[PDB]
């Protein structure tokens, strides 16, 4: 049974940097890419890391991504407001054939 | 400019079927690998469908058999047949772009769902 | 509560084709002997088509071979799929629960059936 | 040919006994179970009276249903306003496999 887990929720206030884990089984997230999506409010996810670690298209600087062994890292220097929004981590899980993707996190500012 | 707008949400009645549409500019559906992927409100993105290039289809485990993706010959655009509905099928459909099996790049703005009387 | 609500009923054109549903809740369609019955604005019940537990069918004269009658697997909701209609098919069709063959106990609301251009 | 024959209309007032009579040939009634149901203005039939003489599930009082021969008969003590609706005899011909109604009463109180 392989659906990788995220916290329900992850909140900071600003200047001060944010970390999101996305943990899984090693069937997908140990043997296939993670990537991260930010979803807005109302809106539609928008791609924000890719291929474990790149940046896309100058997404907004010091959002890092990072990848130890079966889990997955998003990182945002300081909680600025805007980047309030929903985080998703997806993977191709081949055992299932499928993308699979994790709880989401409820970003908040303090 | 790079854009997916789809079509056909609305309420419909539990069995019923629809024909949901995804139109593509900019880019060429019958290449690029398409994907259909819906999120209940309050809810996470489940992947429901891929085509790939040369035709083939993948399809989820709570999405198999009833539904189907198709990929016009001509209109630049794709389709989701979605037939025997329940209660679990109530949606916000998107169509991405996705880069091979890694990454999806681009979404469409969304097309509700409801099944309900 | 028992309740059975009807629904697919409106305007349509002579030799048209339309599936009315028949919606059971509190009771189970795949069991009580399920029928479907019609009336003509002033006009009197007619018997259209009964559903046995046993998958069996009965339709009447007039009703013969251009309609049928069928049973969800899963739904709880029955189907009457009308087709090749003409003038003396105009009704408020209802779906009734009949123990047995002896009387018709529940009585769902009732939709319009229309058959004009 | 089998179909139960009912008066197009019966009238009486407000404490006066109501009969209905419906009849038809031997084939359906003679042989199968007469049931009485009560249509209301703009709604849906309601059962009441079933299997010759029953009154089910506690429906108002006074109401009677008898069989004689090839004939049925509904008795209502009084003509109520309430009670105005049109009256249905349905039995199962058998020679037909049918469900056979009646003409229908147009019930009026004087």
């Known amino acids: 049974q392989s659906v990788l887990t995220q916290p329900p929720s992850v909140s900071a206030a600003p200047g001060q940097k944010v970390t999101i884990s996305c943990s899984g089984s090693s069937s997908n997230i140990g043997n296939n890419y993670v990537s991260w999506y930010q979803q807005l409010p109302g809106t539609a996810p928008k791609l924000?890391?890719?291929?474990?670690?790149?940046?896309?298209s100058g997404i907004p600087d010091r959002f890092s991504g990072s990848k130890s062994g079966t889990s997955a890292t998003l990182g945002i220097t300081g909680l600025q407001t805007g980047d309030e929004a929903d985080?998703?981590?997806?993977?191709?899980?081949?055992?299932?054939?499928?993308?699979?993707?994790?709880?989401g996190t409820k970003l908040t500012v303090l | 400019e790079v854009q997916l707008v789809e079509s056909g949400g609305g309420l419909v009645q539990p069995g019923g079927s629809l024909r949901l549409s995804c139109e593509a500019s900019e880019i060429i559906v019958n290449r690029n690998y398409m994907n259909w992927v819906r999120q209940a409100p309050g809810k996470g993105l489940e992947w429901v469908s891929i085509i790939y290039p040369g035709g083939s289809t993948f399809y989820a485990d709570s999405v198999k058999g009833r539904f189907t993706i198709s990929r016009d010959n001509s209109k630049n655009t794709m389709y989701l047949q979605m037939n025997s509905l329940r209660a679990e099928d109530t949606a916000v459909?998107?169509?991405?772009?996705?880069?091979?099996?890694?990454?999806?790049?681009?979404?469409?703005?969304g097309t509700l769902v409801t099944v309900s009387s | 509560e028992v309740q059975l609500v009807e629904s697919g009923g409106g305007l349509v054109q002579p030799g048209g084709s339309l599936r009315l549903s028949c919606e059971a809740s509190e009771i189970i369609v795949n069991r009580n002997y399920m029928n479907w019955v019609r009336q003509a604005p002033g006009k009197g019940l007619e018997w259209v088509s009964i559903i046995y537990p046993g998958g069996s069918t009965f339709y009447a004269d007039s009703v013969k071979g251009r309609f049928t009658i069928s049973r969800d697997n899963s739904k709880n909701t029955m189907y009457l799929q009308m087709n090749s209609l003409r003038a003396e098919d105009t009704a408020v069709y209802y779906c009734?629960?009949?123990?047995?063959?002896?009387?018709?106990?529940?009585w769902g609301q009732g939709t319009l059936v229309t058959v004009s251009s | 040919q089998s179909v139960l024959t009912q008066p197009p209309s019966v009238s009486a007032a407000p404490g006066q006994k109501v009969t209905i009579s419906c009849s038809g040939s031997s084939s359906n009634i003679g042989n199968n179970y007469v049931s009485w149901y009560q249509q209301l203005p703009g709604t849906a039939p309601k059962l009441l009276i079933y299997?010759?003489?029953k009154r089910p599930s506690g429906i108002p009082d006074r109401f009677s249903g008898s069989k004689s021969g090839t004939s049925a008969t509904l008795g209502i003590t009084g003509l109520q306003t309430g009670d105005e609706a049109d009256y249905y005899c349905?039995?199962?011909?058998?020679?037909?496999?049918?469900?056979?109604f009646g003409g229908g009463t147009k019930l009026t109180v004087l």
């Open positions: 349905g039995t199962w011909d058998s020679s037909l496999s049918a469900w056979v």
């Open positions: 299997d010759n003489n």
């Open positions: 009734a629960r009949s123990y047995g063959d002896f009387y018709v106990d529940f």
